[PDB]
Amino acid sequence: FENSLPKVSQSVYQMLLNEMVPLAMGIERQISGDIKRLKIEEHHTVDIIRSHNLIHELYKADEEEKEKVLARLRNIGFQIGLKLSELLIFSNNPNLKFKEMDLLLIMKFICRDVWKQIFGKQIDNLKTNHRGTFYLLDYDYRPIQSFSLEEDAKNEELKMIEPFLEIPVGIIRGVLSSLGYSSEEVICLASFIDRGVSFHVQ
Amino acid sequence: RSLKAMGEEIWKNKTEKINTELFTLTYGSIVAQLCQDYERDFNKVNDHLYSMGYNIGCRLIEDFLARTALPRCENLVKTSEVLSKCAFKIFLNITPNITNWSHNKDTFSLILDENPLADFVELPMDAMKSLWYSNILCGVLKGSLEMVQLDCDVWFVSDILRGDSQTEIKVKLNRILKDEIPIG
Amino acid sequence: PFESSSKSDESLGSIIIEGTLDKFQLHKYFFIRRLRLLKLEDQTLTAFVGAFQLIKNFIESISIEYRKSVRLLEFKHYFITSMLSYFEFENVSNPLLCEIKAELLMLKRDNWVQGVMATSETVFQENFLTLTKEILSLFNKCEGKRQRIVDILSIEIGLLYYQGKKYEEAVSLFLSCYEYYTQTNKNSIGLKILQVFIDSLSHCPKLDVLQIDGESVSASAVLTNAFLNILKLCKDNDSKEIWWKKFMDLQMKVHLARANVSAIEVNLKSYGFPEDISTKTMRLSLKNMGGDVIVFGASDFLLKKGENKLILECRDIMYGEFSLLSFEIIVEGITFVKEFPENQDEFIVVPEIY
Amino acid sequence: LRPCFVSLIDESDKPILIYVPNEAENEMNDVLKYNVLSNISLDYFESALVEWHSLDSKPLLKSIFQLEGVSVFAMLIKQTGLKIVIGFEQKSLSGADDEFEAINQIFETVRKIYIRVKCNPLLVSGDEKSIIKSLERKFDELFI
C-alpha cells in the first residue's frame, strides 16, 4: 500500500504550475504576428516581459482577448487531465465502468485520488444536488497560498487570482472527457469558514 | 558537512511528490502548446522556453539559497561542485557529471544521466534535427546564475532523444558581474 | 453441497494429479470427476453453460493432453465427447442462451471436423460443410444479439458458394454488407470481399443488376472498384485499378461523383498572362498511371462564380504535376473579392468532385 | 510463448492496431484469418458464457474460444473501455498452469507500452498514423 517509487520536489512543480499562466499570456500577447527587456545570445536576441507585469497586462486586457486566453488554460489543463487520468488507470480503481451513469461514484474517485495526487490532500467536502450539479469545496487551494494580496486592495486581488482557476477546470474537464463526453462545468468563490474555491459540474 | 552530505540531507526535510505522472507531462503539455500555437515552428519554441526558463530560474535562486545557506560562488570549480552535488539533487533527485573543461577552466560540460523532464518521449522526424527539448533547464541555469552576480551562457550540445551522444550542456563564465556600490 | 463438491473436486483432482504415473488412465478419472461435477450441476439456467465451460476448458486441457496427428482421431473421439455433450445440451425447445451454447458447440464440432477432413467425398464435403454452416448460421441468427459472428458466418458461406463456380453471389449482391465491412474499421476482410465481388462480376456475363433498389448499372463494378482502388495496398496492385478503369472506359455509363481521395492537388498564387489571365497554377498527385481530364477549379465571388482555369489535354503522369490552368473570361474585371469554392473536378468520362 | 497476433480495440467498433509478428516474409501468413477472430472477439464480450466480475479491482483474463488451432485471450480493462486480444497456437502452448501468469505479464507489458505510446505529448490529438507506426516499432522491439 505504501509505494516508495521515485519522486521530485513539490516546490518546483508548484511554481511551474504558477508560471503556466504568464506563459499563456506571453504566448497570446506575443503570437509574433506583425516596458520589455532584451537578452544576449550568440548572434541572437530574445525580448521578454516579466511575470507580474504580464498579470498586470491581464488587468489591462481586452475582453475578447481575455476569453481567448482562457480557452488555452482549459486546453492545457484538459491535456494534462486526460493524460493524468490515463495514468491513474494503472491504479485499477473498482468504482466505474464507462460513460458515468452514477456520476457521484466518480466524484468519490476524483476527490479521493486525483486531488490527492496533484495537491497532496483530499477535497474536504462535496455537496450533492441530485440533478447532476455537484458542489465542491476546499478550504485552502494549494497554489494560491503563496500569492500575497497587497495592502488593502483586495478587489484587484480577486480579479488577479481567479484567472489561475482555469487549470483545475481543465483538470476535471479532462478527466471527464477521458471517460467520454463534455458537459458544462464552472467555478465559484465560497469564502471559507474556519482558518478557498468551489466547483460545479454536470 | 560536505556538499554531497547537505544535498542528500535536505531529502529528509523536503516535501515530495511523484516524478512520473506529474511534472513530466506538465513540461510535455506546455511544449505541445508551443508546438501547436506556432504551427510546428522548431526554433521560436526554444526562444519562448528559454524566456520562461530565465524567469523561473531568477525566481528559483532565492529558494535555493534560502534552503541551504551558502556563500557566493566565484569560479567554475565551486559552481561545478554545487550544481552537480546539491542543486539537481534537491530539485530533481539526480546528479550529473562534469567533464570537458578548457585549459583555463573557463568552461565545463554537464553530462546528465537520467533527465526526468523527458521520460519516454521519442520526438518525431521533423523535430529531431532542428529542436532542443529541455530548454527550461538552460533557462534555469541562465536565470539562477545571473542573480548570484555572474553573467553566463548555457547551451545544449546533444541529447539522448535525437542523438546517440548523451545529454550535455555547455557553459561559459562570460566575466564576473561587478556589484555597484556608490550613490553617484 | 454444490460449492463443497466443486471445491472438493478441484482439490481431489489436484491431489490425484500429485501422483505422476498412469496419465493415460487418468483421463478416465478426469472424466469421472467431470461426471461428478455434471451430476451436481443438473439444474442450472446459465451456470450449466459455465459447466459447459467446465467441459470446454477440460476440452482445452484434453487437447493439451493428447499431442499427435493420430490424436486428431482422438479429437474425433472429442467430437463424440462434443456430440454426446450436445446430447447433454439438447434438452430445450428454444432459449436465448441455449441457442448460443449450441452455436458454440456446433462451431467447435465443425472446426474439429474441418481439422480432421483436411488431413488428407470431395464434392460432398462442400455440401456437408454448407449444411453445418447453415445450421450454425440459423442458430446464431436465432438470437437477440451477435450480428458480428453472423456476418462472418454469412461471408464464409458466400465464400463456400464461391469455392465452386457460382454466378449467384450473395456477398457481391450484398454491397451493403461489403460497405458495412469496408466503409470503416474492416480492411483486410474488405480487400478480399471486394476481390471476390470483382471476380464474380468478371464471371457474371450478365447485365441484370441488383433488384433490392434502383441500382441497375453495368458500372456497379467500377463503383465498387473505386473503393477497391482506394483501399488497395500500394502500386504493386495498380494493374487491377488500371484494368478496372480501362473496363469502365470501355463499357461507358458516364454519370458518377467520386470523392477523389486517391488524388491530391495543391494550388499556388494567382498570376496573369497574354490576353487572358492564366491564374492559379496547381500541382497534382495521382495513383493511376494515365489520366486525362478537363479539370476546372471553380471560385466564388460575392454573388458570382468564375469556374475558370481548365486544361483540355493532360499527359501528366507524376506527383506534383504542375498544371498551368489557363483561366479565360475573368469575371468582375479581375476583382479580388473571389473566394475559394473549388470543385476541382477532373472528369475522365466520370466526375471526381473533390 | 511468443504470440501469433495482437489486437487492440477501443470503445467503438474500431481497431487501434492489428499487429502480427513477422510481416517481412509471406510464410503462409494470412491477415484475413486473423481479422475474422478479431471481429468475432468483440462479439463474444457480450456473451453470457464468460463474465468479468468487477469485485476485484485488478482487471482479469479470460479464454473466450479456440478456432483454427489458435487460442485467443481477451482482457477487458474496465475503466477506459479498451479491449485487447492476444492469440497463441497449441504448439506454443504447454498446457500447464505456470504459463498463465506469464500470459498476464505479456498482457500488462503491452498495455504499458500502449499507455506510454498514447501519452506522447508531441503527437497531434486525433487518430494519426504515427500512433500505429510508434506502436509497431515498439512491438518489433518487443518481438523479433
mmCIF file of all heavy atoms in Angstrom, chain A residues 6-8 10 13 19 26-27 30 32 39 41-42 44 48 51 72 76 80 84 117, chain B residues 15-19 21-22 26 29 33 37-38 44 50-52 55-56 93 155:
data_model
loop_
_atom_site.group_PDB
_atom_site.id
_atom_site.type_symbol
_atom_site.label_atom_id
_atom_site.label_comp_id
_atom_site.label_asym_id
_atom_site.label_seq_id
_atom_site.Cartn_x
_atom_site.Cartn_y
_atom_site.Cartn_z
ATOM 1 N N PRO A 6 10.117 6.470 -7.326
ATOM 2 C CA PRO A 6 10.881 7.740 -7.398
ATOM 3 C C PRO A 6 10.072 9.033 -7.472
ATOM 4 O O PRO A 6 8.893 9.031 -7.817
ATOM 5 C CB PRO A 6 11.720 7.567 -8.673
ATOM 6 C CG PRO A 6 11.123 6.405 -9.382
ATOM 7 C CD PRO A 6 10.739 5.519 -8.270
ATOM 8 N N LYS A 7 10.696 10.124 -7.031
ATOM 9 C CA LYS A 7 9.999 11.352 -6.677
ATOM 10 C C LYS A 7 10.908 12.552 -6.906
ATOM 11 O O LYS A 7 12.132 12.424 -6.966
ATOM 12 C CB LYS A 7 9.538 11.330 -5.209
ATOM 13 C CG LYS A 7 8.230 10.593 -4.939
ATOM 14 C CD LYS A 7 8.100 10.181 -3.493
ATOM 15 C CE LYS A 7 6.743 9.560 -3.240
ATOM 16 N NZ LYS A 7 5.686 10.218 -4.056
ATOM 17 N N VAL A 8 10.289 13.731 -7.033
ATOM 18 C CA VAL A 8 10.980 15.019 -7.060
ATOM 19 C C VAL A 8 10.297 15.969 -6.081
ATOM 20 O O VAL A 8 9.360 15.599 -5.369
ATOM 21 C CB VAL A 8 11.031 15.654 -8.465
ATOM 22 C CG1 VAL A 8 11.942 14.876 -9.389
ATOM 23 C CG2 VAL A 8 9.640 15.754 -9.049
ATOM 24 N N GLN A 10 8.137 19.096 -4.495
ATOM 25 C CA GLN A 10 6.814 19.664 -4.729
ATOM 26 C C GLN A 10 6.908 21.115 -5.186
ATOM 27 O O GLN A 10 6.044 21.592 -5.937
ATOM 28 C CB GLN A 10 5.983 19.545 -3.453
ATOM 29 C CG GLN A 10 4.480 19.674 -3.624
ATOM 30 C CD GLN A 10 4.001 21.103 -3.505
ATOM 31 O OE1 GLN A 10 4.709 21.961 -2.985
ATOM 32 N NE2 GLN A 10 2.790 21.362 -3.978
ATOM 33 N N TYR A 13 7.400 22.049 -8.965
ATOM 34 C CA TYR A 13 6.178 21.799 -9.719
ATOM 35 C C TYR A 13 5.141 22.868 -9.429
ATOM 36 O O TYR A 13 4.419 23.285 -10.339
ATOM 37 C CB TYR A 13 5.597 20.419 -9.401
ATOM 38 C CG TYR A 13 4.155 20.235 -9.877
ATOM 39 C CD1 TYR A 13 3.897 20.008 -11.224
ATOM 40 C CD2 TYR A 13 3.057 20.283 -8.993
ATOM 41 C CE1 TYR A 13 2.609 19.842 -11.691
ATOM 42 C CE2 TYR A 13 1.771 20.112 -9.453
ATOM 43 C CZ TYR A 13 1.553 19.897 -10.800
ATOM 44 O OH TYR A 13 0.267 19.733 -11.257
ATOM 45 N N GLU A 19 3.622 29.453 -12.990
ATOM 46 C CA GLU A 19 4.012 30.216 -14.172
ATOM 47 C C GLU A 19 3.497 29.654 -15.483
ATOM 48 O O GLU A 19 3.976 30.085 -16.537
ATOM 49 C CB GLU A 19 5.514 30.390 -14.308
ATOM 50 C CG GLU A 19 6.135 31.247 -13.249
ATOM 51 C CD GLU A 19 7.608 31.381 -13.455
ATOM 52 O OE1 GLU A 19 8.115 30.695 -14.360
ATOM 53 O OE2 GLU A 19 8.250 32.179 -12.744
ATOM 54 N N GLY A 26 1.951 35.259 -22.303
ATOM 55 C CA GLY A 26 3.044 35.571 -23.205
ATOM 56 C C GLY A 26 2.871 34.936 -24.565
ATOM 57 O O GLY A 26 3.289 35.498 -25.580
ATOM 58 N N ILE A 27 2.249 33.756 -24.610
ATOM 59 C CA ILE A 27 2.077 33.094 -25.893
ATOM 60 C C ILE A 27 0.910 33.718 -26.652
ATOM 61 O O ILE A 27 0.857 33.646 -27.887
ATOM 62 C CB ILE A 27 1.941 31.565 -25.690
ATOM 63 C CG1 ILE A 27 2.236 30.804 -26.972
ATOM 64 C CG2 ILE A 27 0.557 31.150 -25.327
ATOM 65 C CD1 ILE A 27 3.557 31.101 -27.507
ATOM 66 N N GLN A 30 2.297 37.764 -27.311
ATOM 67 C CA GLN A 30 3.278 37.579 -28.377
ATOM 68 C C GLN A 30 2.914 36.306 -29.141
ATOM 69 O O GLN A 30 3.316 35.196 -28.792
ATOM 70 C CB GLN A 30 4.695 37.533 -27.809
ATOM 71 C CG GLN A 30 5.802 37.484 -28.860
ATOM 72 C CD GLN A 30 6.306 36.080 -29.122
ATOM 73 O OE1 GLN A 30 6.265 35.222 -28.241
ATOM 74 N NE2 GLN A 30 6.777 35.835 -30.336
ATOM 75 N N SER A 32 3.706 36.609 -32.352
ATOM 76 C CA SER A 32 4.649 37.011 -33.402
ATOM 77 C C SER A 32 3.973 37.332 -34.733
ATOM 78 O O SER A 32 4.611 37.252 -35.788
ATOM 79 C CB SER A 32 5.750 35.960 -33.609
ATOM 80 O OG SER A 32 5.320 34.953 -34.507
ATOM 81 N N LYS A 39 17.849 40.296 -24.110
ATOM 82 C CA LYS A 39 18.948 39.442 -23.683
ATOM 83 C C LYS A 39 19.869 39.102 -24.843
ATOM 84 O O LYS A 39 19.507 39.219 -26.017
ATOM 85 C CB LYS A 39 18.451 38.153 -23.038
ATOM 86 C CG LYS A 39 18.300 38.280 -21.547
ATOM 87 C CD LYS A 39 17.551 37.114 -20.978
ATOM 88 C CE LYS A 39 16.107 37.200 -21.382
ATOM 89 N NZ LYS A 39 15.622 38.587 -21.186
ATOM 90 N N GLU A 41 22.354 36.447 -26.757
ATOM 91 C CA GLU A 41 22.672 35.076 -27.109
ATOM 92 C C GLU A 41 23.695 35.144 -28.232
ATOM 93 O O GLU A 41 24.023 36.233 -28.710
ATOM 94 C CB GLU A 41 21.409 34.303 -27.525
ATOM 95 C CG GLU A 41 20.376 34.077 -26.409
ATOM 96 C CD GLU A 41 19.469 35.250 -26.115
ATOM 97 O OE1 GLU A 41 19.546 36.268 -26.826
ATOM 98 O OE2 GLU A 41 18.686 35.151 -25.149
ATOM 99 N N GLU A 42 24.234 33.994 -28.637
ATOM 100 C CA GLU A 42 25.253 34.028 -29.682
ATOM 101 C C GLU A 42 24.605 34.262 -31.054
ATOM 102 O O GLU A 42 23.843 33.432 -31.566
ATOM 103 C CB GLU A 42 26.157 32.775 -29.609
ATOM 104 C CG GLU A 42 25.642 31.353 -29.949
ATOM 105 C CD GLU A 42 24.961 30.663 -28.790
ATOM 106 O OE1 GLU A 42 24.606 31.347 -27.815
ATOM 107 O OE2 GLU A 42 24.779 29.430 -28.861
ATOM 108 N N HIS A 44 22.147 36.261 -31.654
ATOM 109 C CA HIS A 44 20.733 36.005 -31.423
ATOM 110 C C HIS A 44 20.270 36.859 -30.251
ATOM 111 O O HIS A 44 21.022 37.085 -29.300
ATOM 112 C CB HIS A 44 20.487 34.517 -31.140
ATOM 113 C CG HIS A 44 19.041 34.145 -31.046
ATOM 114 N ND1 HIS A 44 18.325 34.232 -29.870
ATOM 115 C CD2 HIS A 44 18.180 33.675 -31.977
ATOM 116 C CE1 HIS A 44 17.082 33.836 -30.085
ATOM 117 N NE2 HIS A 44 16.968 33.494 -31.355
ATOM 118 N N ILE A 48 11.876 39.831 -23.638
ATOM 119 C CA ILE A 48 10.923 39.231 -22.711
ATOM 120 C C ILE A 48 10.203 40.313 -21.917
ATOM 121 O O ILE A 48 10.585 41.484 -21.901
ATOM 122 C CB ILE A 48 11.575 38.235 -21.723
ATOM 123 C CG1 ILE A 48 12.320 38.968 -20.607
ATOM 124 C CG2 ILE A 48 12.527 37.299 -22.430
ATOM 125 C CD1 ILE A 48 12.691 38.079 -19.448
ATOM 126 N N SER A 51 6.787 38.428 -15.175
ATOM 127 C CA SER A 51 5.500 37.757 -14.971
ATOM 128 C C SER A 51 4.433 38.685 -14.405
ATOM 129 O O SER A 51 3.301 38.714 -14.900
ATOM 130 C CB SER A 51 5.666 36.557 -14.039
ATOM 131 O OG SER A 51 6.724 35.719 -14.429
ATOM 132 N N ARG A 72 -7.144 28.618 -23.740
ATOM 133 C CA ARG A 72 -5.852 27.944 -23.759
ATOM 134 C C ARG A 72 -5.531 27.311 -22.411
ATOM 135 O O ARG A 72 -4.937 26.229 -22.362
ATOM 136 C CB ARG A 72 -4.766 28.931 -24.175
ATOM 137 C CG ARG A 72 -3.448 28.304 -24.522
ATOM 138 C CD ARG A 72 -2.622 29.237 -25.377
ATOM 139 N NE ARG A 72 -2.986 29.197 -26.790
ATOM 140 C CZ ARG A 72 -3.735 30.106 -27.406
ATOM 141 N NH1 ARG A 72 -4.214 31.146 -26.739
ATOM 142 N NH2 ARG A 72 -3.999 29.975 -28.698
ATOM 143 N N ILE A 76 -4.876 23.324 -21.847
ATOM 144 C CA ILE A 76 -3.680 22.706 -21.274
ATOM 145 C C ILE A 76 -4.001 21.901 -20.024
ATOM 146 O O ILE A 76 -3.444 20.805 -19.821
ATOM 147 C CB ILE A 76 -2.589 23.774 -21.072
ATOM 148 C CG1 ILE A 76 -2.270 24.358 -22.441
ATOM 149 C CG2 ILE A 76 -1.351 23.272 -20.356
ATOM 150 C CD1 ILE A 76 -1.753 23.275 -23.386
ATOM 151 N N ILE A 80 -3.385 17.748 -19.669
ATOM 152 C CA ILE A 80 -2.726 17.120 -18.522
ATOM 153 C C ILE A 80 -3.736 16.334 -17.680
ATOM 154 O O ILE A 80 -3.382 15.311 -17.085
ATOM 155 C CB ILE A 80 -1.937 18.173 -17.708
ATOM 156 C CG1 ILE A 80 -1.032 17.523 -16.663
ATOM 157 C CG2 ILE A 80 -2.826 19.171 -17.015
ATOM 158 C CD1 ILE A 80 -0.042 18.469 -16.090
ATOM 159 N N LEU A 84 -3.182 12.445 -17.117
ATOM 160 C CA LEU A 84 -3.027 12.066 -15.720
ATOM 161 C C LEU A 84 -4.080 11.044 -15.310
ATOM 162 O O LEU A 84 -3.788 10.123 -14.541
ATOM 163 C CB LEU A 84 -3.107 13.320 -14.852
ATOM 164 C CG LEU A 84 -3.166 13.327 -13.324
ATOM 165 C CD1 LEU A 84 -2.196 12.361 -12.645
ATOM 166 C CD2 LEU A 84 -2.905 14.734 -12.866
ATOM 167 N N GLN A 117 -3.325 13.493 -5.659
ATOM 168 C CA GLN A 117 -2.096 13.380 -6.433
ATOM 169 C C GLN A 117 -1.557 14.745 -6.839
ATOM 170 O O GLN A 117 -0.343 14.972 -6.796
ATOM 171 C CB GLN A 117 -2.325 12.502 -7.660
ATOM 172 C CG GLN A 117 -1.061 11.830 -8.152
ATOM 173 C CD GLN A 117 -0.791 10.496 -7.483
ATOM 174 O OE1 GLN A 117 -1.437 10.124 -6.503
ATOM 175 N NE2 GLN A 117 0.191 9.774 -8.000
ATOM 176 N N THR B 15 9.341 18.437 1.196
ATOM 177 C CA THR B 15 8.079 17.869 0.736
ATOM 178 C C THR B 15 8.206 17.380 -0.705
ATOM 179 O O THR B 15 8.818 18.034 -1.556
ATOM 180 C CB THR B 15 6.936 18.878 0.912
ATOM 181 O OG1 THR B 15 5.700 18.298 0.474
ATOM 182 C CG2 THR B 15 7.198 20.230 0.236
ATOM 183 N N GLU B 16 7.700 16.175 -0.956
ATOM 184 C CA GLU B 16 7.980 15.456 -2.189
ATOM 185 C C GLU B 16 6.684 14.979 -2.823
ATOM 186 O O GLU B 16 5.646 14.876 -2.166
ATOM 187 C CB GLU B 16 8.896 14.251 -1.941
ATOM 188 C CG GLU B 16 10.277 14.603 -1.444
ATOM 189 C CD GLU B 16 10.883 13.512 -0.585
ATOM 190 O OE1 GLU B 16 11.018 12.378 -1.084
ATOM 191 O OE2 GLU B 16 11.233 13.778 0.582
ATOM 192 N N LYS B 17 6.768 14.667 -4.114
ATOM 193 C CA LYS B 17 5.680 14.034 -4.846
ATOM 194 C C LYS B 17 6.263 13.329 -6.066
ATOM 195 O O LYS B 17 7.432 13.520 -6.405
ATOM 196 C CB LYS B 17 4.618 15.038 -5.288
ATOM 197 C CG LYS B 17 5.075 15.868 -6.428
ATOM 198 C CD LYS B 17 3.908 16.281 -7.223
ATOM 199 C CE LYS B 17 4.399 17.064 -8.371
ATOM 200 N NZ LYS B 17 5.604 16.470 -9.008
ATOM 201 N N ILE B 18 5.395 12.573 -6.753
ATOM 202 C CA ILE B 18 5.753 11.608 -7.794
ATOM 203 C C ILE B 18 6.359 12.301 -9.020
ATOM 204 O O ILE B 18 5.931 13.391 -9.420
ATOM 205 C CB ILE B 18 4.507 10.762 -8.126
ATOM 206 C CG1 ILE B 18 4.836 9.542 -8.973
ATOM 207 C CG2 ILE B 18 3.324 11.596 -8.627
ATOM 208 C CD1 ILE B 18 5.653 8.590 -8.265
ATOM 209 N N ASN B 19 7.428 11.706 -9.578
ATOM 210 C CA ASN B 19 8.180 12.408 -10.622
ATOM 211 C C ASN B 19 7.690 12.014 -12.008
ATOM 212 O O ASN B 19 7.816 12.789 -12.960
ATOM 213 C CB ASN B 19 9.684 12.142 -10.504
ATOM 214 C CG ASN B 19 10.071 10.712 -10.820
ATOM 215 O OD1 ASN B 19 9.337 9.773 -10.537
ATOM 216 N ND2 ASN B 19 11.243 10.544 -11.421
ATOM 217 N N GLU B 21 4.003 10.850 -13.843
ATOM 218 C CA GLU B 21 2.544 11.045 -13.844
ATOM 219 C C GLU B 21 2.118 12.455 -13.373
ATOM 220 O O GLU B 21 0.981 12.847 -13.630
ATOM 221 C CB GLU B 21 1.734 9.961 -13.080
ATOM 222 C CG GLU B 21 1.852 9.793 -11.553
ATOM 223 C CD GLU B 21 1.047 8.637 -10.982
ATOM 224 O OE1 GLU B 21 0.387 7.916 -11.755
ATOM 225 O OE2 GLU B 21 1.115 8.423 -9.754
ATOM 226 N N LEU B 22 3.003 13.235 -12.749
ATOM 227 C CA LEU B 22 3.009 14.688 -12.726
ATOM 228 C C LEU B 22 4.413 15.076 -13.149
ATOM 229 O O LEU B 22 5.294 14.213 -13.202
ATOM 230 C CB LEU B 22 2.706 15.265 -11.341
ATOM 231 C CG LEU B 22 1.287 15.442 -10.801
ATOM 232 C CD1 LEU B 22 0.539 16.435 -11.663
ATOM 233 C CD2 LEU B 22 0.507 14.161 -10.627
ATOM 234 N N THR B 26 3.552 17.941 -17.466
ATOM 235 C CA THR B 26 3.410 19.397 -17.422
ATOM 236 C C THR B 26 4.291 20.062 -18.475
ATOM 237 O O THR B 26 3.815 20.878 -19.282
ATOM 238 C CB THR B 26 3.798 19.926 -16.042
ATOM 239 O OG1 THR B 26 2.960 19.350 -15.040
ATOM 240 C CG2 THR B 26 3.634 21.431 -15.997
ATOM 241 N N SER B 29 3.090 19.025 -21.885
ATOM 242 C CA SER B 29 1.868 19.684 -22.316
ATOM 243 C C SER B 29 2.144 21.124 -22.738
ATOM 244 O O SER B 29 1.551 21.618 -23.707
ATOM 245 C CB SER B 29 0.830 19.613 -21.201
ATOM 246 O OG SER B 29 -0.303 20.380 -21.530
ATOM 247 N N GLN B 33 1.761 22.811 -26.394
ATOM 248 C CA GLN B 33 1.131 24.114 -26.620
ATOM 249 C C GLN B 33 1.975 24.995 -27.528
ATOM 250 O O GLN B 33 1.456 25.620 -28.465
ATOM 251 C CB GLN B 33 0.930 24.824 -25.289
ATOM 252 C CG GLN B 33 0.295 26.184 -25.383
ATOM 253 C CD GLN B 33 -0.972 26.158 -26.199
ATOM 254 O OE1 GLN B 33 -1.981 25.593 -25.783
ATOM 255 N NE2 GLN B 33 -0.936 26.791 -27.362
ATOM 256 N N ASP B 37 0.832 26.146 -31.292
ATOM 257 C CA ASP B 37 0.448 27.544 -31.449
ATOM 258 C C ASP B 37 1.313 28.294 -32.460
ATOM 259 O O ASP B 37 0.841 29.265 -33.057
ATOM 260 C CB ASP B 37 0.505 28.257 -30.094
ATOM 261 C CG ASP B 37 -0.539 29.355 -29.963
ATOM 262 O OD1 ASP B 37 -1.115 29.775 -30.984
ATOM 263 O OD2 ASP B 37 -0.809 29.782 -28.824
ATOM 264 N N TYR B 38 2.564 27.886 -32.652
ATOM 265 C CA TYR B 38 3.440 28.427 -33.687
ATOM 266 C C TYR B 38 3.385 27.679 -35.008
ATOM 267 O O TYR B 38 4.243 27.941 -35.861
ATOM 268 C CB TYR B 38 4.891 28.471 -33.208
ATOM 269 C CG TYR B 38 5.228 29.477 -32.136
ATOM 270 C CD1 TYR B 38 6.410 29.363 -31.410
ATOM 271 C CD2 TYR B 38 4.367 30.530 -31.841
ATOM 272 C CE1 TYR B 38 6.735 30.278 -30.426
ATOM 273 C CE2 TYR B 38 4.695 31.465 -30.884
ATOM 274 C CZ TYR B 38 5.878 31.325 -30.171
ATOM 275 O OH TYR B 38 6.202 32.235 -29.192
ATOM 276 N N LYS B 44 11.483 29.087 -32.621
ATOM 277 C CA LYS B 44 10.820 30.063 -31.763
ATOM 278 C C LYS B 44 10.374 29.444 -30.444
ATOM 279 O O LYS B 44 10.284 30.146 -29.423
ATOM 280 C CB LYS B 44 9.630 30.655 -32.510
ATOM 281 C CG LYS B 44 9.356 32.121 -32.227
ATOM 282 C CD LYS B 44 8.157 32.639 -33.022
ATOM 283 C CE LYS B 44 8.265 32.320 -34.512
ATOM 284 N NZ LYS B 44 7.121 32.856 -35.297
ATOM 285 N N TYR B 50 13.188 29.269 -23.383
ATOM 286 C CA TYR B 50 14.333 29.873 -22.720
ATOM 287 C C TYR B 50 13.933 31.126 -21.952
ATOM 288 O O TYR B 50 14.497 31.412 -20.891
ATOM 289 C CB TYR B 50 15.399 30.170 -23.768
ATOM 290 C CG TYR B 50 16.671 30.756 -23.242
ATOM 291 C CD1 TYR B 50 17.599 29.958 -22.579
ATOM 292 C CD2 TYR B 50 16.972 32.098 -23.451
ATOM 293 C CE1 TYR B 50 18.784 30.486 -22.111
ATOM 294 C CE2 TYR B 50 18.154 32.640 -22.987
ATOM 295 C CZ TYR B 50 19.054 31.828 -22.319
ATOM 296 O OH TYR B 50 20.230 32.368 -21.860
ATOM 297 N N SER B 51 12.937 31.862 -22.462
ATOM 298 C CA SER B 51 12.393 33.023 -21.755
ATOM 299 C C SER B 51 11.702 32.629 -20.454
ATOM 300 O O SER B 51 11.968 33.214 -19.387
ATOM 301 C CB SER B 51 11.408 33.752 -22.659
ATOM 302 O OG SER B 51 10.579 34.607 -21.893
ATOM 303 N N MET B 52 10.812 31.627 -20.530
ATOM 304 C CA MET B 52 10.115 31.146 -19.337
ATOM 305 C C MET B 52 11.081 30.477 -18.368
ATOM 306 O O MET B 52 10.915 30.574 -17.144
ATOM 307 C CB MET B 52 8.995 30.178 -19.738
ATOM 308 C CG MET B 52 7.993 29.792 -18.632
ATOM 309 S SD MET B 52 6.998 30.969 -17.651
ATOM 310 C CE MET B 52 6.728 32.424 -18.680
ATOM 311 N N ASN B 55 12.889 33.291 -16.442
ATOM 312 C CA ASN B 55 12.015 33.840 -15.416
ATOM 313 C C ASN B 55 11.904 32.877 -14.226
ATOM 314 O O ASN B 55 11.964 33.306 -13.064
ATOM 315 C CB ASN B 55 10.664 34.145 -16.060
ATOM 316 C CG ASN B 55 9.724 34.938 -15.177
ATOM 317 O OD1 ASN B 55 8.601 35.297 -15.540
ATOM 318 N ND2 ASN B 55 10.176 35.159 -13.957
ATOM 319 N N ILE B 56 11.868 31.564 -14.491
ATOM 320 C CA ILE B 56 11.702 30.642 -13.369
ATOM 321 C C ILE B 56 13.038 30.429 -12.646
ATOM 322 O O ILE B 56 13.069 30.218 -11.429
ATOM 323 C CB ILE B 56 11.034 29.322 -13.828
ATOM 324 C CG1 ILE B 56 10.670 28.431 -12.649
ATOM 325 C CG2 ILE B 56 11.883 28.501 -14.723
ATOM 326 C CD1 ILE B 56 9.796 29.167 -11.677
ATOM 327 N N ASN B 93 16.233 15.098 -7.862
ATOM 328 C CA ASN B 93 16.716 13.805 -7.329
ATOM 329 C C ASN B 93 17.771 13.146 -8.216
ATOM 330 O O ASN B 93 17.917 11.923 -8.213
ATOM 331 C CB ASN B 93 15.577 12.811 -7.062
ATOM 332 C CG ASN B 93 15.823 11.964 -5.830
ATOM 333 O OD1 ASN B 93 16.962 11.795 -5.399
ATOM 334 N ND2 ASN B 93 14.758 11.404 -5.275
ATOM 335 N N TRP B 155 24.171 26.309 -22.983
ATOM 336 C CA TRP B 155 23.632 25.839 -24.256
ATOM 337 C C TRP B 155 23.751 24.330 -24.343
ATOM 338 O O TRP B 155 24.731 23.753 -23.868
ATOM 339 C CB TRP B 155 24.366 26.454 -25.466
ATOM 340 C CG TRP B 155 24.495 27.902 -25.320
ATOM 341 C CD1 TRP B 155 25.625 28.571 -24.969
ATOM 342 C CD2 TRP B 155 23.431 28.861 -25.266
ATOM 343 N NE1 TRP B 155 25.361 29.900 -24.821
ATOM 344 C CE2 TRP B 155 24.018 30.106 -24.981
ATOM 345 C CE3 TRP B 155 22.048 28.800 -25.493
ATOM 346 C CZ2 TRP B 155 23.277 31.273 -24.907
ATOM 347 C CZ3 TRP B 155 21.318 29.955 -25.411
ATOM 348 C CH2 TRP B 155 21.932 31.172 -25.121
#
